[model samples]
Target: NSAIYFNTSQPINDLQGSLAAEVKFAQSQILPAHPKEGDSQPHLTSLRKSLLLVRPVKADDKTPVQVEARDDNNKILGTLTLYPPSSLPDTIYHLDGVPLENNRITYAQHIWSAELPAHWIVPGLNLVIKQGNLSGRLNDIKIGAPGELLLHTIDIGMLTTPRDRFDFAADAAAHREYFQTIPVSRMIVNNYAPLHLKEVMLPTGELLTDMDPGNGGWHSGTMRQRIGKELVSHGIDNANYGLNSTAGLGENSHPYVVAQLAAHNSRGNYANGIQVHGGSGGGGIVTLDSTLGNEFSHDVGHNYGLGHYVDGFKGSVHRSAENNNSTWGWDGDKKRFIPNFYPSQTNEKSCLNNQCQEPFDGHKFGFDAMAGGSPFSAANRFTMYTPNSSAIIQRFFENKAVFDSRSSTGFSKWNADTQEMEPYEHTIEARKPEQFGVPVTTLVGYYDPEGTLSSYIYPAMYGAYGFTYSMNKFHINVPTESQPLDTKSLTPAPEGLTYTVNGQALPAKENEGCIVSVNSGKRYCLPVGQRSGYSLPDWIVGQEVYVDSGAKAKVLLSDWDNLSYNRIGEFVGNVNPADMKKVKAWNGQYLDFSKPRSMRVVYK
Candidate 1:
């Protein structure tokens, strides 16, 4: 890092400012990724579209610093005049680096910049910094490639609705300037567009239903599907969606949704690929009501598969790094060096009330973008990504998805009714249903919250029933063509108790609704009701059968947890509703779903 120091109070005939012998060209200007003790920090600026950052010892706002771009022959192509650092918006220059003392006192003061015009930016250009006969020339500066980001904003009944919160256009411009100074290899070019949604109507044409802008549509899963569908409808794939909503401001607010392995784009899986909390170009939600933070970058970190610093899973950690002495880095989207990232580790059992406990086997959550924000300063919380996270983002830029101009460029508003850009149109392929053998009719039951009995009849299931276990409950998935399985919940009995089948009393027990834990260690009651279905084995007290096969299943013997009939070599016989009461006991081993019943059972 070369700092250009100047004592403007005195004049030297030939003035020499900080200009390194071999200045590597960049597309944007930012602080150094790696800094050392007592190093003069000057912004690493680009020869093209350069941000003119300079600092003078004396605070003089009257005279601007003159910078000129020259050709090989020493002919000047363009010039940029930089005034006081205060001339730029505070948001553009605010330094949020860590160790506040280093940034506020030593590093960020007296900086100046007057951004250059696009046409004046060129590769292999010679730059000369001048002030009152004092001059410095950084010759033949080399330039590197630039990265790109598309910011898609959706109103979602917020932003301009109810009332205006802030200026989105200005915010987008701020982000463009902010991301330049961060740690990535290439400067990023950001473009944005507003996404439009339309109203939906009823099938009978009696009433028109307006689009949902209220909290009812606030779930991430719901909006994830909606935004995804809208994007595909418009043939838009490369951009991420920024959903703005007052609904998201409440306790139920969901910040953002990103597709798994989004950067890789495997299997052409574009649904919910890129999304964030607010309309701001960055990730996370940003409202005008507060100062902007690094949430935008954090969400982008997630899109690139960066896990939480104290992740229970595979969170990348820098175990050896310490406070300011640790590996110093940039915000990658801001002007300041990212606050120091400390090495830490965490796991599932280590959390309580959603906050993970620290000092568990020696890992602390440092100030990384992937870590939570409560412990960091709001102004600087948006800090650096871990080394591993940075490496992945760098690799992301290498993919054509980041460089290719075809689908990667452009922005537009979509009209859902027409399924086209406010000024566009694209057709979606019709969907086809899964083809299968004769459809089977099946009846499934469950107890609702009030303990009310509820039963559902699936008219056509293609022999694809299955059950699952989760959190001490069993769930049955009635097989249907539905893309996602629609499952019913069932409660399980206490570990040691056995439920009676169809209210029948055991021989010696003689207690109705009471079956032997294991009658003579042989016969056990298997309740047939929905509750019994989840608790007992095979006795059919909770089931009704319409299968073509005649006889009732011969005492289903599978363990309660192994009720699923989909497994290979499992017996699937007929279920006789009338014979259900007669067979009051099962051997407590194997169970049948009537060979063709295709019942999906889940043991949780």
Candidate 2:
């Protein structure tokens, strides 16, 4: 009826003779008694078969208990050691009795067990236990297969600024402490529920500082992308990067990150690495204020393709709920489902929250890790994944053969022109869009250090649908959704510090808020005045603009048909607005578009 749990101190390929070992109690205390016939709770049955818990008979001294396994011939096979209950990790077990003199429990005992190799554990074996001078022996004890435990490595990236209240080192330590508490939830699962192998999350030991900008000055919308670029600089291969940034939104806000599934079709697909900010596949990023909650687990669930378990929402459909999980299940004489996880308090008996206790009220806890559900209490909403989600996560991490074969072959892009997804090659020229015959205008807005912009210009291009802004050696097309641009796209041609499209230099109409030329002149131009319904303010027409590193500059262009407006590019780095007009009389121009150019441009 009782078992002692132990595992090999060091790996033993052949348990030939006198193998050293240690006694361990199951994180889940006493395994449930064997289920009776017709009972089908997988965890209760599997926990007994996969993990064995041994009850220590009795010990005289307070020393660690040592055990030796032997064959019928009396030849010593292996030895196991059991630490005093107080000496075990707090996360392991909460002993029933308190130690007296030196933190040693001598009177009563809790369960103990070992997870050993299937080959090593066969019928007909005896275990001998020796604690100090006391000795005890057990004959023909039962053994079972060891449960699988997976180890996941995460790389921590910190982005902090002088304005941040938390420092880097303390935040890093906080991250470690927080992760240490996660195994209690067993985020990933197999079909066996609580009896499955729990995942262990640990940092990769390298606290990356290469991506930290001293000021955390990256634009908010482009912050993750900038982080991706920085991480790419360091060569992101397979690292699961988690960012702890003090630079994200306000401290009161929880982290808002999208955990991408490991496979997909998209250009500039950050699939392999750069997971710290936004990488394809499974990875997460969180702000310092959001580090110690269930949000990280929720996001990681996304990385593994586990969808939200929305109970009864028609507007949104989750894959897991639709194809996988059932809303409810049956228990003996009552309606039941897996309840949420609750952390163990030192004041009471609890292990890792995964296998601790049942709800006192016996009311069903409706929520799972995917977010929908009512908790035992309104104040504490600790939860885990549904059965389907757990199985999917287990398959994702444990079954590499299935996932690797099913992963996408390469990165792809959706070509609106062809209306199909095509493989996207990474290259400077390959990133641009193809030339469409329509004349696309490139608008450049400049801002000066004094918060007033310099002059702005609308240079018309004969071929491309969008313009590529290249500044500080980094080029990005505006209005494009991180897509691969056509190779034969138009770029601004430089002529003596001024950029031009065709040839003729069109000047802004003097004393007017916008230019309005009637016949399209030698070069194509769109009307920009009150009559045209697209006039700019007087202060913006001839203003000199400077874009500093990390500042936001937005440019808009009409679509290929000139029918619809498109915001082609938003520059967030240090780049000088391309000068298209070279009139010496103009102090080159500056702008402060703090005022609106039109009703629609302002608030409408």
Candidate 3:
């Protein structure tokens, strides 16, 4: 009877219900301990976490519709609207049905709470949910508890696998070709640094790399071998040759490779400390991993006697100043190394007065003495050291591999006809003419040594015969012709008129009736009324007649050399016939105007 009464008691039931509610409240308030101690607690640093929305499509396609987010319990949280054509302000966000330009939303502490609802998650574990006709997959999806979520949709067409991206092979091939396209001058500068510095003495007292007599081989295999052999043959110790590769670095290798090498050498860490511990004369060798090759070449220029110049004067040593003043400077004694290239100068003497040798000088050896050595002579030094020193190095380095082999023996056997080696055949096309406006014929025989053979030929009919002669003499000739018969009657002939007749200009003055009046003080003239089969004018004795109304009129001259003068009336109104005059009576010696004859008339 007691058990049945106790089980049916109402107060006990109320107490049990209260205890269950208390337990539920405690569970909701408690938080799990952090996985690691001393870990910084995460805070609501941003109003909306993982809130970005993105969509991708083909460049030509339209953008997809907007995406929205909701609480885990399926409550409306926020909405994101997307724009078309990939312009800025591409996406807009609205939180809790309110537009937010800043796209942020914050909840009160312990008020709205920060727990994600289960209903908001996508069914397939893809965080992005597609509604309506919008077709695409969401990527970079991120969500935090209590309605904070961000995601971007990428169009299927816009996505590409890593393998299908750029044609890296073609790009690399193009880059290599560009690298090979380096000017020959730069090659010369890069290859002759040691010679310029007088660090390597040649057997012939010339700064040229000697070819092996036995195999006719140059040190073409590697830069190290080439530099080492040259140094050793010049009495440098074998221990000075310390070559190391930086191939371990990846593509786009760190720019610090050379600096690192220099650092290690300076610290006595390289080549078993041989370079550092050895005599001051010993220099270390570093094999650049392509990335650092340019820098290495630049630095090598300093290793020679060249030092950086300031306003045409020798300033700080190359490596020293760069190390001291630059953020990229090495942490070492800067003066220990040399510099490259001469600085700009206002005066030639100022430039010449500097002790540092220019990278491109004709003399390879530096005039300045080494740290503790005698000054090197400029004349007896390397022939490659001419004014364009850097250019020489570039050429040698570029062609080093080719020149080092026995195949280069045929270099001296160049052929003019084939424009290749004697055993080979290659033709060179003519170059376009220059704009200096010299007669095309003037440039024709330039390569021809013998004056007897004219390399250029002019058309039979061009300017007046006399004008043609004047042109050859580098004079500007004005072509003039007789006026028409009707026009001559209308216009009175000027007194003492000397006239020029036109047919077609000839190269030789004797070919046409053209003559120069001796008494008229004119440069040339045509004999009056002379027809073909008539005697030609004698330069010694010719009656100089005044140019009539038909004479001294402007006529055009052909411009075979330049096509710009092809239009009609190019030289039409340039000559004045009234200026013609005859001072003395002359004898007619040369007069031949059978075929069309053009003559140049000179006035006294």
TM-score of each candidate?
A: 0.33, 0.28, 0.15
Error of 2 at 113 (Å): 4.9
User: Candidate 2 or 3, higher TM-score?
Assistant: 2
What's the lDDT of the predicted structure labeled candidate 2? 0.27
Off by over 4 Å in 2: 1-220, 225-235, 238-289, 310-358, 361-368, 372-392, 400-604
Each prediction's whole-model lDDT (CA): 0.30, 0.27, 0.19
lDDT of 1 by residue, 98-133 (tens): 331121212233555655433344344567876565
| CA shift of 115, model 3, Å | 62
The per-residue C-alpha lDDT of model 2 at residue 598 equals: 28
**Residue range 458-534, candidate 2, lDDT tens digits:** 12111122222220111122322232100133344322221111111122221112222111112212222222135
Cα misplacement distance, residue 16 of candidate 1 (Å): 9.4
* lDDT of model 1 at position 2: 25
Best-performing candidate as measured by TM-score: 1
Model 1 RMSD vs true structure: 30.7
